[PDB]
Amino acid sequence: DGGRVAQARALLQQCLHARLQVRPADGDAAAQWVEIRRGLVIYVCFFKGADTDLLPKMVNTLLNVKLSETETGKHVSILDLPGDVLIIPQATLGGRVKGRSMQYHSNSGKEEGSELYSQFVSLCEKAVANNTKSVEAGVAVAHGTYGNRQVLKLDTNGPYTHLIEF
Amino acid sequence: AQARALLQQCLHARLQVRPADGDAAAQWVEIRRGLVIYVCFFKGADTDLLPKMVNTLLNVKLSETETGKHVSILDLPGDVLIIPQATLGGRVKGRSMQYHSNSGKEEGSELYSQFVSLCEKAVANNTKSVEAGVAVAHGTYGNRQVLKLDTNGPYTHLIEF
C-alpha cells in the first residue's frame, strides 16, 4: 500500500440502549438528549487529505458489516438486524501517543471535519431510509453534536467492539 | 504488531464476570471514576513487553481534571477496568471480519492474566492511587462482556503496540 495514509477511523459497538447528550445545560435550560434502543454505535474520526469517495464507502462498509447478533446467535448487519444507529463524533480516535501526551496532527481541521461529519450523518440517514427492513421496523438514526462533550451512557449485552480504517 | 488497546474514560462501569446459571444470578464487578481498557493480543506477542505496555496505558494523560487539563489515571487518581476484547483485532473482509492475527485461547488467556496482574501491581505501587483506595477490576477472558457504561465523554483513544 506504499504508506498510503489513512483517511478515517470508525469504532463500532453494539448496544441494547444508548443515551447521548446533544446540548449541554445552559443556565435555566436543562441539557438535551437523544437515545436509541438496540443498535449500533459508530464513533467517527476523519483525517486530512481524503478522497471524494470516502463517505459513501464508509456508509456502505459500516452499515453492511455483519456485527449484530440475531436471536440465533448468527451475525448480521445493522440494516438486517434491523436496529438503530447512533453516530458519535470522536476525533480523539486519531490521536497518536507522544511521551505521555497525544498528538492529533493527522486529524481534519474543525471546518473540514464538521462538514464531513454532517455529510456522513446525512448519507447514513438516507441509507437507512432506503432499506426496507429498517423502514418497516421503524428504526432510527441519531447523532452527536459536532464540537460538544459526548456525554454518553451505554447499556450493552457485550459491545463486541471493532475498529475499521479507511 | 503485539497488541491493541482502546481507552475510554468513565464515571461508572459495571461488567458481568459470570453469567447467570439457573438460580445463581449473574456476578459482576464495578468501578467508579476511572479508565476502561479494552485489550487485544496478537499471535507471538512478547510477554517481556507487557510491563512497558501497562506503563504506557496507566501513565498516558487522558483523564480530565476540574481545570480541564489532562493527567494519567495514576495521577487523577481513578479506577481501572480491564475488558478482554480480541474483536478489536478484527479486520474487515467484505461483509465479515477476519481475526487471523489474534492470539489463540491458550496464549491469549495467559497474556491477559499477566497484563491484569501487572496493572494491579502498578496501581498498588502508586502512592496517590493507594491513598485514595482506587481499584483495578477485570473481565473474565472469553465470556460475553456484558457492560453498562456511564461517561462524561468517553474521550476514546486507541494505542497500538
Side-chain angles (χ1 to χ4, degrees):
Chain A
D1 89 335
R4 163 141 288 176
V5 308
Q7 280 177 253
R9 186 166 294 165
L11 189 83
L12 265 61
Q13 297 183 314
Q14 297 303 308
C15 66
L16 301 173
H17 181 267
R19 170 180 178 82
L20 181 61
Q21 185 172 101
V22 290
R23 196 198 275 283
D26 189 333
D28 296 342
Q32 286 153 30
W33 303 85
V34 74
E35 314 196 333
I36 59 150
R37 298 154 293 169
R38 171 71 195 281
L40 173 72
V41 177
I42 303 171
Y43 303 71
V44 279
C45 173
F46 297 101
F47 296 122
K48 290 148 119 295
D51 310 335
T52 333
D53 71 354
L54 169 69
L55 303 180
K57 289 196 218 200
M58 296 180 69
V59 169
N60 179 56
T61 303
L62 301 171
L63 296 181
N64 293 285
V65 71
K66 305 184 290 186
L67 296 177
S68 300
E69 235 185 277
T70 72
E71 199 274 342
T72 66
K74 182 179 140 78
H75 293 285
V76 300
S77 71
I78 192 70
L79 293 181
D80 279 333
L81 179 64
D84 293 341
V85 179
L86 172 66
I87 299 166
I88 312 201
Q90 200 89 336
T92 54
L93 291 162
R96 306 173 181 173
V97 69
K98 180 226 193 24
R100 306 297 191 202
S101 284
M102 283 287 172
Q103 289 182 314
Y104 307 90
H105 292 293
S106 304
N107 287 359
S108 296
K110 179 232 173 177
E111 297 143 76
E112 189 192 293
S114 204
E115 179 62 48
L116 293 164
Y117 181 79
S118 288
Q119 291 173 316
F120 184 67
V121 174
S122 174
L123 291 170
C124 285
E125 291 177 336
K126 288 161 166 64
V128 170
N130 295 333
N131 193 77
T132 306
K133 205 153 174 207
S134 296
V135 169
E136 291 183 349
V139 309
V141 181
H143 70 280
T145 308
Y146 188 81
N148 283 6
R149 188 186 286 276
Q150 307 304 314
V151 177
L152 175 65
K153 178 182 287 193
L154 212 59
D155 184 39
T156 81
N157 191 34
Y160 202 65
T161 313
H162 290 71
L163 178 86
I164 295 171
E165 312 268 342
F166 299 80
Chain B
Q2 304 281 121
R4 198 171 281 181
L6 196 80
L7 280 40
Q8 285 187 324
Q9 299 297 308
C10 62
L11 303 169
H12 179 66
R14 185 153 185 280
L15 180 65
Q16 186 170 290
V17 290
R18 186 182 304 185
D21 175 48
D23 268 300
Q27 294 179 9
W28 308 82
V29 293
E30 299 188 353
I31 63 155
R32 308 160 255 103
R33 177 78 192 271
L35 176 64
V36 180
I37 310 172
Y38 300 83
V39 287
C40 175
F41 296 104
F42 300 123
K43 268 161 196 186
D46 195 344
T47 58
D48 212 35
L49 304 183
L50 299 177
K52 163 67 149 184
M53 178 183 179
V54 166
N55 182 93
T56 294
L57 305 172
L58 298 188
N59 285 279
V60 69
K61 304 190 293 190
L62 297 174
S63 302
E64 198 184 328
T65 66
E66 1 101 61
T67 67
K69 81 199 174 304
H70 299 80
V71 296
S72 63
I73 191 63
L74 299 183
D75 282 329
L76 178 65
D79 300 335
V80 179
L81 171 68
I82 301 159
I83 305 185
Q85 201 92 342
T87 52
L88 283 174
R91 284 285 245 65
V92 69
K93 164 255 142 80
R95 268 54 53 204
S96 275
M97 281 279 167
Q98 152 280 113
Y99 307 95
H100 180 77
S101 49
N102 291 353
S103 59
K105 170 186 252 259
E106 188 158 64
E107 176 190 20
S109 193
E110 149 95 293
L111 293 160
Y112 179 76
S113 278
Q114 273 178 36
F115 175 87
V116 168
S117 185
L118 286 165
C119 283
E120 297 166 344
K121 179 173 136 57
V123 162
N125 276 288
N126 188 61
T127 308
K128 202 178 161 172
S129 294
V130 172
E131 177 62 36
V134 300
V136 179
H138 64 283
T140 298
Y141 185 79
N143 283 7
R144 175 195 292 282
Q145 298 304 307
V146 173
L147 175 69
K148 306 160 171 296
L149 199 66
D150 191 31
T151 78
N152 190 38
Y155 203 64
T156 306
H157 285 69
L158 173 92
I159 304 185
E160 315 276 21
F161 296 89

